[PDB]
Design a binder for these strands. Sequence first.
DNA 1: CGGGCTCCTCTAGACTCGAC
DNA 2: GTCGAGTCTAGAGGAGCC
Lengths: 353, 352, 932
Amino acid sequence: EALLEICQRRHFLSGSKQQLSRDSLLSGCHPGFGPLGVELRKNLAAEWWTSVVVFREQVFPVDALHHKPGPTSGKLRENLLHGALEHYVNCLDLVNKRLPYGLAQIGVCFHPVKSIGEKTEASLVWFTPPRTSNQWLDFWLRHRLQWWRKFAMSPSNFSSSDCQDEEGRKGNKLYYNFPWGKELIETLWNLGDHELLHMYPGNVSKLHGRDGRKNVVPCVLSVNGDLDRGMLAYLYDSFRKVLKLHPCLAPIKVALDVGRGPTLELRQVCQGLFNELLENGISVWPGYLETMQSSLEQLYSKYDEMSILFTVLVTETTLENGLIHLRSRDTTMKEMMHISKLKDFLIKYISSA
Amino acid sequence: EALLEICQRRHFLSGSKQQLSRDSLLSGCHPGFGPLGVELRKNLAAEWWTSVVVFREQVFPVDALHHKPGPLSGKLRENLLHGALEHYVNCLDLVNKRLPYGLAQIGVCFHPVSIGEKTEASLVWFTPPRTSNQWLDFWLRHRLQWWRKFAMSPSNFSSSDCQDEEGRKGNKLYYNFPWGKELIETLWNLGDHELLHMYPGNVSKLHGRDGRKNVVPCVLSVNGDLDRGMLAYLYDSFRKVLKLHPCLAPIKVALDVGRGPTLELRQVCQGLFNELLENGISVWPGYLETMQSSLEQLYSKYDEMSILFTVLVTETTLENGLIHLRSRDTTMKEMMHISKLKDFLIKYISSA
Amino acid sequence: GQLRHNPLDIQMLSRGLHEQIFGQGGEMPGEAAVRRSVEHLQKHGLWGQPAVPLPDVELRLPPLYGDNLDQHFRLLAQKQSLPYLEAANLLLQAQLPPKPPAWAWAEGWTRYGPEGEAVPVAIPEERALVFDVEVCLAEGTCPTLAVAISPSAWYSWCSQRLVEERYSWTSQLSPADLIPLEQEQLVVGHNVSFDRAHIREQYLIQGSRMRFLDTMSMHMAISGLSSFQRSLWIAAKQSWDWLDISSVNSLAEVHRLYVGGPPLEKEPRELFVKGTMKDIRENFQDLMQYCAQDVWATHEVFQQQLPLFLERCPHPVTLAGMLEMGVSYLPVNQNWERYLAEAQGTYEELQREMKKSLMDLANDACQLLSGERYKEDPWLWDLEWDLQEFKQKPCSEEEEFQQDVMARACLQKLKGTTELLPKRPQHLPGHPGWYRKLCPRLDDPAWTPGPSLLSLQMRVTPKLMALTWDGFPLHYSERHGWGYLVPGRRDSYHHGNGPYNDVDIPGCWFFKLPHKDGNSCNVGSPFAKDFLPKMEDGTLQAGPGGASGPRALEINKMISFWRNAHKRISSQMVVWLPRSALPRAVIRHPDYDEEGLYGAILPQVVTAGTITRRAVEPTWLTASNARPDRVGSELKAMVQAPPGYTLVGADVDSQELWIAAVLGDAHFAGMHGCTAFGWMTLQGRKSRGTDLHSKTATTVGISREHAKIFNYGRIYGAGQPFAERLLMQFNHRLTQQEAAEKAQQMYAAGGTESEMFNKLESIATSDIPRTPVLGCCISRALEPSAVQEEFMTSRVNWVVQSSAVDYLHLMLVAMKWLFEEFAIDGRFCISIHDEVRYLVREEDRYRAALALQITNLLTRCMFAYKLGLNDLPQSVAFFSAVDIDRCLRKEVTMDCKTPSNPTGMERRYGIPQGEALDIYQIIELTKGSLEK
DNA sequence: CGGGCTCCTCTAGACTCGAC
DNA sequence: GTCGAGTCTAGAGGAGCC
Ligand SMILES: Nc1ccn([C@H]2C[C@H](O)[C@@H](COP(=O)(O)OP(=O)(O)OP(=O)(O)O)O2)c(=O)n1
Ligand SMILES: [Ca+2]
C-alpha cells in the first residue's frame, strides 16, 4: 500500500484510503485525480495522440457527443465507437473516398457499476477493406503493444491475447500484470460491416470506399484503450522510494530550488530560469517560493517521490560563475552545469527519451 | 450564412446542411465538430492553458467529474466551480496553506435547452477579501487581452460591468456577432458563501494564510465558453478566405505535387511531411490525391481551410530544391530552398 | 526384368538406364576381389543383412554425344565454354595502346582511339574486356565511373550522378542507373562479381550469353592459400617454401606474385570509401588513372594466370562450371523492403528491452559511491569509482512587464559568463569512472539519455547483473577469461576448471567457467548460447533473480544473428525492373501486382574463394534459415520468384560421405559396397530415416545436424576428446563418463574406414595431388614439394571437398545442356555448396525436376566411372526429393515464423507451401519425357 | 590434428592534435 | 610544450553457412 500512500501524499490521487481501494480505482467510482495525476494522464494522452494520429496521413480527430439523444429519454455514452461510426460518410469526403482511414478520439465513457463510473478512453475506428483486415488488425496489435511497452520499466508486464466474439469475430486484448493479477487495458476488435449497414440502412453506394480501383464496404476495426488504468499501470510499473516514470510521462520535469543568500538576486535568477523553461515547454516545480526551509536530503526525497527528473539548484556561486547544480533522479549524482546550457540539455533529454 | 456553409464543407462543423443552425450552434445542441473544428478548439484550449495555468505558480489543474452523486438520483455537472470547491481543502496543502492559489480546468458542461453540451474553460481564484476587486480587475484585463490577442478586429470583443441580484460585482465579456452581441465569458466575485455552505462548521479547515493572519478566502469565478469563442473567431476570420490566427489555425502547411515522376516527388514530399510533423507543424497531405485539380481550385480550398502556406513540389525540387510557397494572407508566391522551410515556418509562427 | 544386383547383393541401376549410360559389356570384377569383399563384410557383420529392393525406373535419357560418359561431358563442356575460351585468348594476345593523356568528362561510354582521341559510343562493342567499377560509397550503391580495357582500344564510363549535381537522386536503383553493356562476351576482373552487379542487362529476368571470369578465383585455383596460411603469410611478410609461390587475394599481391613488376599504387585518401562526391569531382583524373592502373594490373595477371589455370585444371568441365557459377540471380519484390523494416524494428524493440534492465541496474549501482560502499560489493569492488572536478579557467501591466524584462535581462547577463569556462565540455565529471564510459557524449548525433552504450557483451554487464556460478560470484581475469571466486583461502573443496593461482585474489581461489571447446579456451561472455542450459539448470544465477537472466540470454540468442548480419542484409544492392523490362508472362499472370515492385539481387560470388575451390559470398552463403527464435532469419525466404515463375532445386544426399565411400570401394576391390563403410552408406533411405546421420542421431540423442557435425569431424581427424566435448555440448543429459563410453563405441575401428583413409592419404601425399574425377590439381602452396608434411588435415579434406566442387561443376554443366536442348525456359538461380536452385517457369517446373534427376544420375554415374567402377547403385541414382517452391527455404513444408515474421509466410506475404517430389512422381507428371 | 569460409562487437594500445 | 581527449588498428572471443 506504499504506492497508494505516496500517490495520496504527492497528489496523484484524491481522497483517502476508503475511496482509493483497488476496486474503486479499477471501476471508475473513485474521486478525481490530483494535479500530478491529471498531468500524467495528459502526458499519456498526448503520447497516444502523437503516435496514433499525428504521424498518420489518414487518421483524423472526431468529436462524439457525451450523450445519445432520442430512442424518448437519452443516455450517456458507454463507448466512442458509435459516435465515430456516425461520421464515416462525412469523413469519406476528406480522404476522397480512399481507404484505409481512421477516426480517433479521447473522451470520458460512462460505465454502470447503481454507481456510475467514469473512464477516460482512447478510440481508433479503423475503416479497412475486407481484403487486408486481418493484416491491419495484427499491425495495430503490434503497434499498440509496442506503444504500451516503450514507456514501461518492465515491458514484459504488458501482454496480449487472442480472443473471439460471440459471432466468432477475431480480436485481441491487452493486459498489464498488476501485483494482484492481469487487468484489461486495451481491446482491438475486427468488426465487419454489420454496424455500418445497421447504422446506414438502404443503398450501400454511400458507404463504398476505394481499395485501389475497387469500391467496397469497409470492415470496421475498433481499438479502445483505458487511459486511467493505463496511468495506474504505469504508476505501479514505476514503483529509496522513487517513481521512475518515463521522461515523456513524468508530470513535472524539473524542480527549481535556491541556496543561501543573497535572496533577492537569486529569486530574480530563479524566476528568469522558470520563465525560460516554461516558454520552452518544460514543466517546473517552483521550490524557490517555499518559505518553509527544508534539508536538501528531504527535498530530494520529496522530489523523487514526485517523479522529478532533475533538481536545479541556484546558489550564491551561480552569480559569479554561472554554474548550477543538477541532480538526476536516475543516478542521484550531482553535476555542475552552466546556466546557458540547461534549456538545451533538458529539451534534448526530453526529446531523446 | 455563407460562412456556415464554408465551415460545413471544409469540415469545421459536422452534420448535414440543415442539421446545423445558429441557435443550435449557440446552445450546444449541434451534432458536433468536424476535425478542423476539433483542432481549432484544441488550439484554443492550449492557448487558454498557456495563458492561465502554465505561466503562474498558483494555478493548478483540477479533476472534476461529469456527474455529482448523492442527494441534491445523480446529476450531470452544470458548472466546473463545484469540483474545484470540493478540491479546495486538499489542494490547499500543495501551497502549504499559502494564498492566493488557483484551480483551473477545461471540460464539457451540460445545460438544458434537450441536452446542450458546452466546453467551458473555468478558473477559480482563492483570495482574501482584501484584494478581491483588484484580482477581479486583473483577471478581467488579462482575459480581455487574451480574447483580443487572436482577433483581426479586437473591437468586437467588448466588455461590461454588471451587478447580480445579491449585489456582488462581476464582469461579462462579449463578442459582436453580425446579428448582435453574444456572451462569451463572465467573471464574478462570489465571496465565501459557497465555500462555507459546502464546508459547514469548523471554519479552521478553510483558513488560509494571507501573510501573517489566517483568512477564509473569497472565490473568484472566471468562466468562458470555448465553443462560442471558436464560433466568434470563425466569424472574425471571415475572395472567400478564413484568416485564422496562426496560433489557432488547425492546418498550417499544405503539401502537394505538381508533375511527374510520382515516386521521387512522393518520397521528397513524405520526407518534408515527416520533418514538419517532427517539428510540430500541422500538414495537410494533399500530395496523396490521385487526380490533382487546378492550382486555383486547390488555393481556394486551402484558403477556406485556414491553411497558412501551400508547398508545391515539382521536378525543379529534385534538381535545385526550390519549392513553391504561397502565402494565404498576401496571396503572393515565392520560391525558397526546401532545407529552410521548417525554420521559416517556425519563425513565422513564433512571430505571429 | 529391370531388376539388377551385384556380387555383394547391392541393388544396382535399372538395366534400361545402365544400357544407356554404361552401355553393354565391360570388365568383370573377378573372384579374389569378391572373396575379399565377402570376408570383409562377414568380419564386420554386414553380409547377411537383406534389403528390400527399390522400385525400378525406366526412362528414355537424352542421346549422349560421345562414345562414353567422359567424352559426353567433355563435349558438353567444350560446346558451352568454346566462345569464352577464344575471347580469353583474344585478351591473351591483345595489343593495348597507352592510356589517353586526358580522361573524358562526359555521360555514357567513351572510346579512346590512338593519340588520345575520345569518341562518344553507346556500348563498348567488344567480345572480351577487362573491367573495373568505382562506386561512391557515401552516396550509395550507384556506380560512379568505370574503366574497360579492350584488345583494340580503351574505354571509360562516367555516371550521370558524377557529371551532374542535383539536390537529391533516387535511392531506389533502376536499370537506367547502371552501366550499359552487352554472340558471347567475356568480362575479366579481379572481383568481377562486384562489377557484374553494376551492369544494366544483368538484372533482366531472361538470361543473356555474357559470362564473367575472375582473377582471384583463378589465383585460389592455381596458388591459393588457406585462412591459417593467409594469416601466416601476412605475419611472415611483416617448412616455409610455399611463401614464394603464394599470395593473398589482393590485386597488388597477386600482381607481385604473377608479374612482379613495379608495385601497384593505391590512393591514400580513399575518396570512394571515405570521401564524398565533391572529392571525386575534384580528383576525377587521379581516380580514373588509378582505376585504369588496376585494370592494367588485372589484365597482366589474367595473361599470366590463364595458361597456369588451364595446365592445373585441364578438364573443360571445371571451366564451364566456373563460368556457370559466376552468374547468379535472386529475384525479389516489394516484400524485401518490408522484411528489412520489420527485422530492424523488431531488433530495435528487443535491443531497447535488453538495455532497459541494464540501464536500471547501472543507475541503481551509482548509489554505492555514497559512503564508499562499493568496496564491499563482490561484483563492483574492483571497478573505477573515481571522481573528476569540474575544470574551469496584484501587479499592473507595466509592473509585470518590467519584472519580466528585468528577470530576462538578469538571465541573459548570467548566460554571458561563458568566457571563463573551458571550450571543450567535460563528460560527466560527477559520475564515477565506470559510468562515464557507458554514456554517449552530448556531441554524439545518436545520443540517448542514460548509460545507453551498454550491452551483454561488455565486461561490466555480468558484474551489474551479479551473475553467480554455483554460489560463487563471477570474476574476470585478463589471462584466463571469465571465471568465479571460491571464498575460504585462509592462507579447495570445490572442483572445476582449476585453482588458477595466477590471479591471486586474497581469500579466494579463481576457477574458470567451463568452455565448450576445452580448458585451453577462455570464456569472453557468460551470455553465450552455451550457458542457457546452465541458466535453466540453476548453476548460473543472476543477482536480480527471477527470469531476468534467462530473458537476457533469450534476447541475446534472438538478436545475435541480426546484430552481425543487418549491415550486410540491408546493404544488398537491389535493382527494380520497370514494367517495360518485365516479361509479358509476368505481366499477364494473375499474381502480378500492379502497384508492386519487382527486382533482383545478384550475389557477389567469388567462384573459387577456397583452396578447395568452393564459392564464397559474404551474405547469401552465410544466410541462416528460418527459425522460431532468430530475428530476421527468413532472409532466404524473401527470394521470391516473379509472378509466373517457380524455384526448382535439390540437395545432394550425403555428398561427402558417398564420395569418400565410393573412393574407398574403388580402392579396395573395384565394386560398390566392397568396404564396410561403403556398404553402410548405401544401406539407407532418407525417407525411412535410416541413413548414417539419422542412425548416429538415434544412437546418441543429438540432432541430425549435430550428427552431421559429429560424423564429418570424425572423418577428417577429430579425436576422442573432441567427440566427447561435442556429445556433452549437444546432449546435456549425458555425463563425462557416458560421453567417454560413447566416444569409444562410435570410434571402434583392420577397420571399417581403413580403405578410405588409405586412398585419401595416397592422393594427398602424391607429388601433384589431383581430383580423382576431373583431375584438378591442388594449389601450388599445398603440394608436398612445397609444404612437406604440414597441413595434413587440410590436404586430406581437400580431396573430398574438391570432389564435391567437381560434382557441382558437373551438375551445372548437365543442367545447362538439358535446359538448352529441350527449350526449358529457366535459368540458374544460386548454388550453395551442395545445393542447386533454378528459376524456372510455372509451366516447366516438372520438366526442370526431371532434368535435375537426370543430371544427378549422370553425375553419380560419372563419379563411379572415373574411379574404375562400371555400375551405379539404384539407391544413390536420384535425388530423394526435388523442391518446387515460389520462395527459397530449406524445406517446402516449413512456414517462416520468426520474431520478425510471427504470422508466417502464407499469412503475411501470401506464399503457399511448395511440393517435394521423388523421381516416380516426376515421371508420372512428365510422362517420362522432357519435350513440350 | 574436423575441415573450408564469412563477419561482427569489445577492448587495449599507440598515435595525433587542439587547448591551456 | 604538456597533456588529456579523438582516432585508427590489431587481437580475442563469438556466431551464421556448407
Ligand atoms: N559440419 C559440416 C557440414 C557440411 N560439411 C560438408 C560435407 C557435406 O557433404 C557438404 C554438404 O553439407 P550438408 O549439410 O548438405 O550434408 P549432407 O549433404 O551430407 O546432408 P543431406 O543428406 O541432408 O544433404 O558439406 C562438412 O564437411 N562439415
Ligand atoms: Ca547435402
